[PDB]
Every structure is written in C-alpha cells, then in structure tokens.
Scaffold this active site. Structure first.
Site, PDB file in Angstrom:
ATOM      1  N   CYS A  31     -53.892  -4.328 -11.958  1.00 11.86           N
ATOM      2  CA  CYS A  31     -55.294  -4.814 -12.010  1.00 11.86           C
ATOM      3  C   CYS A  31     -55.416  -5.962 -13.003  1.00 11.86           C
ATOM      4  O   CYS A  31     -56.102  -6.956 -12.734  1.00 11.86           O
ATOM      5  CB  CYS A  31     -56.234  -3.677 -12.386  1.00 11.86           C
ATOM      6  SG  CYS A  31     -55.847  -2.855 -13.964  1.00 11.86           S
ATOM      7  N   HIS A 201     -59.830  -0.426 -16.573  1.00 12.64           N
ATOM      8  CA  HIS A 201     -59.602  -1.191 -15.362  1.00 12.64           C
ATOM      9  C   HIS A 201     -59.946  -2.658 -15.656  1.00 12.64           C
ATOM     10  O   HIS A 201     -60.663  -2.926 -16.583  1.00 12.64           O
ATOM     11  CB  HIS A 201     -60.413  -0.600 -14.210  1.00 12.64           C
ATOM     12  CG  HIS A 201     -60.094  -1.146 -12.858  1.00 12.64           C
ATOM     13  ND1 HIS A 201     -58.827  -1.450 -12.443  1.00 12.64           N
ATOM     14  CD2 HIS A 201     -60.910  -1.434 -11.810  1.00 12.64           C
ATOM     15  CE1 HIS A 201     -58.880  -1.899 -11.198  1.00 12.64           C
ATOM     16  NE2 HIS A 201     -60.127  -1.882 -10.797  1.00 12.64           N
ATOM     17  N   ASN A 221     -63.591  -6.068  -7.046  1.00 11.34           N
ATOM     18  CA  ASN A 221     -62.473  -5.195  -7.370  1.00 11.34           C
ATOM     19  C   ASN A 221     -61.244  -5.680  -6.578  1.00 11.34           C
ATOM     20  O   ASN A 221     -61.374  -6.563  -5.721  1.00 11.34           O
ATOM     21  CB  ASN A 221     -62.871  -3.779  -7.051  1.00 11.34           C
ATOM     22  CG  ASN A 221     -62.050  -2.709  -7.772  1.00 11.34           C
ATOM     23  OD1 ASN A 221     -61.086  -3.017  -8.474  1.00 11.34           O
ATOM     24  ND2 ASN A 221     -62.488  -1.460  -7.683  1.00 11.34           N
TER      25      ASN A 221
HETATM   26  C1  LIG Z   1     -54.713  -1.558 -13.659  1.00  8.14           C
HETATM   27  N1  LIG Z   1     -54.332  -1.463 -12.482  1.00  8.14           N
HETATM   28  N2  LIG Z   1     -54.246  -0.869 -14.747  1.00  8.14           N
HETATM   29  C2  LIG Z   1     -53.188   0.110 -14.731  1.00  8.14           C
HETATM   30  N3  LIG Z   1     -54.923  -1.016 -15.939  1.00  8.14           N
HETATM   31  C3  LIG Z   1     -56.055  -0.099 -16.092  1.00  8.14           C
HETATM   32  C4  LIG Z   1     -54.446  -1.884 -16.882  1.00  8.14           C
HETATM   33  O1  LIG Z   1     -53.507  -2.577 -16.632  1.00  8.14           O
HETATM   34  C5  LIG Z   1     -55.134  -1.950 -18.258  1.00  8.14           C
HETATM   35  C6  LIG Z   1     -56.004  -3.213 -18.247  1.00  8.14           C
HETATM   36  C7  LIG Z   1     -57.068  -3.227 -19.363  1.00  8.14           C
HETATM   37  C8  LIG Z   1     -58.144  -2.123 -19.265  1.00  8.14           C
HETATM   38  C9  LIG Z   1     -57.759  -4.594 -19.379  1.00  8.14           C
HETATM   39  N4  LIG Z   1     -54.139  -1.911 -19.313  1.00  8.14           N
HETATM   40  C10 LIG Z   1     -53.349  -0.752 -19.396  1.00  8.14           C
HETATM   41  O2  LIG Z   1     -53.543   0.265 -18.648  1.00  8.14           O
HETATM   42  N5  LIG Z   1     -52.304  -0.856 -20.277  1.00  8.14           N
HETATM   43  C11 LIG Z   1     -51.222   0.129 -20.383  1.00  8.14           C
HETATM   44  C12 LIG Z   1     -51.533   1.369 -21.221  1.00  8.14           C
HETATM   45  C13 LIG Z   1     -52.574   1.409 -22.176  1.00  8.14           C
HETATM   46  C14 LIG Z   1     -52.844   2.576 -22.919  1.00  8.14           C
HETATM   47  C15 LIG Z   1     -52.038   3.719 -22.695  1.00  8.14           C
HETATM   48  C16 LIG Z   1     -50.997   3.690 -21.735  1.00  8.14           C
HETATM   49  C17 LIG Z   1     -50.755   2.520 -21.004  1.00  8.14           C
END
Ligand SMILES: *C(=N)N(C)N(C)C(=O)[C@H](CC(C)C)NC(=O)NCc1ccccc1
Length: 254
Positions: A31, A201, A221
């Site tokens: 995302c 997200h 989205n």
């Molecule tokens: C999107 N498809 N994903 C998995 N997300 C929600 C992300 O990439 C987010 C993006 C932010 C909210 C802007 N970042 C993460 O999920 N980073 C990896 C992470 C963070 C905390 C704990 C475990 C992994």
C-alpha cells in the site's frame, strides 16, 4: 486562495489518466508504494501540463527502494518520496495490462469484500527482486525510463493546508489507522465505530466534499474497483479521524 466546498482532482485534471485509475496491490503489503506511485503519476502529469502522462511502476519502487522498509511486509512514506526524487521510478501498469517498463507481477484479488476476482486470502507474496530491466517489448532501457521528482515533504496536520496542497499541486499520499470495521466498508462516509486496530494503511487523497452537512475526504484505495465505492472511499474530514490528517506526504517535479 479560496478553498471550495468540494474538490475532485479527477474533474480538475481529467487529461491525466492516472488520476481516475484504481490499482490493486494484490497479496502484497505494498500500500505504501501504491499510494506513492499513484500520486507521483498524477503529479508528474498535473505539474507538467500533461506532458508526462504515465503510469509509474509500483514494482520498481517496491522492489528497489532499500530505505523504504519491508517491501511486501510494509513500508514507509517519506523514503518512498525521497526515492522518487533521487533515483526516480520507471513506468509500469497492472499485471493484466502488462504495459510499460515494469508491470506489476501480482494478480487482482478481493480484499475482504465480495466480487468477481479471487479472494486475496491471508497469504502474502515474497517481495519481488529489484530487476532493473524493462519487459522485452518495451524499447527504452530501464535507467532511461526513470521519472524523478525535485522535492518531497510532509504536509502539516492542518485541514486547510492539506486542501490547499491538493488543489494546487494534486493528490497526496496519506497514512491512517485501520480498525477492523474498515474491512467491512461498502460505501458512505467512514469513521471508526467498532473493532480493534490492524495497524495502518496508505492511500491517495484526491479531494473532499460534504454530504448532509458531513464533511469528508475523497480517497482512492488500492484494493481494485470492486472494493468500496468503485475503488474509492470517503472518511470524516476535520477531526483527524484515524489520523488521516497527520500522515500526509507528497512532492513536486519542479
Ligand atoms: C500496506 N499494504 N501495508 C502493509 N501497510 C499498512 C504499510 O506498508 C504501512 C504504511 C504506513 C501506515 C504508512 N507500513 C507498515 O506496515 N510497516 C511495517 C511494520 C510496521 C509496524 C510493525 C510491523 C511492520
């Protein structure tokens, strides 16, 4: 300048085909990279008066940006925009369209909603390798297909600032907190009512409006056109709902 009661980037810059293009990140936690390349595509076109009218490659950014986090396991907004400024990003469409230098490798799937694509389910693909190679039919070498920004920045946690930024410079990327009830969204103006956090997200904010006195942001989205309102959703505006006003990032080509 005066901020209008509603704004839709799709209507302001319709020559820019990316602005109304909904993408699908598939079974990959990319995302972060989707919201980035979508808004970067939009801004490249808007800020060049339509001279650039391209679909930037999600997989190039996802696979090649080392400072951007954990790839299909999630990533980070600021370094994604820094990567666009410094290294640039090549072109590339969806898997099904397979156009441009590096089209996406992963197929469309349903993200916790009903429709005509296979369900995404719970499994995640491994992050693709950084291949630095355009597909055989595309006749520009990878490094020469790069599109770069000039600056990147976070936008202030201020509603008016975010409105001004979108209307002058184009759609922005933004993070927000996902609670379980977001996965049940079908239509309307979302706010968190039930459920625990699923983390965050990253999405693309394209405008704003108001309906029945309720102000909202209008958002693309990256879960295909079957999700939500033909791929879009609306969320409460003005109250930092789910942190939607607090994690905005964008950038400019000039
Ligand atoms: C999107 N498809 N994903 C998995 N997300 C929600 C992300 O990439 C987010 C993006 C932010 C909210 C802007 N970042 C993460 O999920 N980073 C990896 C992470 C963070 C905390 C704990 C475990 C992994």
């Amino acid at each position: 300048v005066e901020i209008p009661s509603s704004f839709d980037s799709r209507k302001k810059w319709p020559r820019c085909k990316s602005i109304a293009t909904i993408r699908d990140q598939s079974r990959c936690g990319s995302c972060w990279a989707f919201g980035a390349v979508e808004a970067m595509s939009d801004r490249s076109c808007i800020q060049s008066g339509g001279k650039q009218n391209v679909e930037l490659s999600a997989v190039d950014l996802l696979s090649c940006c080392e400072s951007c986090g954990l790839g299909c396991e999630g990533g980070i907004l600021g370094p994604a925009w820094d990567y666009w400024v410094k290294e640039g990003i090549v072109t590339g469409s969806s898997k099904e369209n397979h156009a441009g230098c590096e089209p996406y490798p992963f197929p469309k799937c349903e993200h916790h909603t009903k429709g005509k694509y296979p369900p995404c389910g719970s499994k995640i693909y491994k992050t693709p390798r950084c291949k630095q190679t355009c597909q055989k039919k595309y006749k520009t070498p990878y490094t020469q297909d790069k599109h770069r920004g000039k600056s990147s920045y976070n936008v202030k946690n201020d509603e008016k600032a975010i409105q001004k930024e979108i209307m002058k410079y184009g759609p922005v990327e933004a993070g927000f907190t996902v609670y379980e009830d977001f996965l049940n969204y079908k239509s309307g103006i979302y706010k968190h009512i039930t459920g625990e956090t699923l983390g965050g997200h990253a999405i693309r904010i394209i405008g704003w409006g108001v309906e029945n006195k309720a102000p909202y942001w209008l958002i693309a989205n990256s879960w295909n056109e079957d999700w939500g309102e033909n791929g879009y959703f609306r969320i409460v505006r003005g109250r930092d709902e789910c942190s939607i006003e607090s994690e905005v990032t964008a950038g400019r080509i000039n």
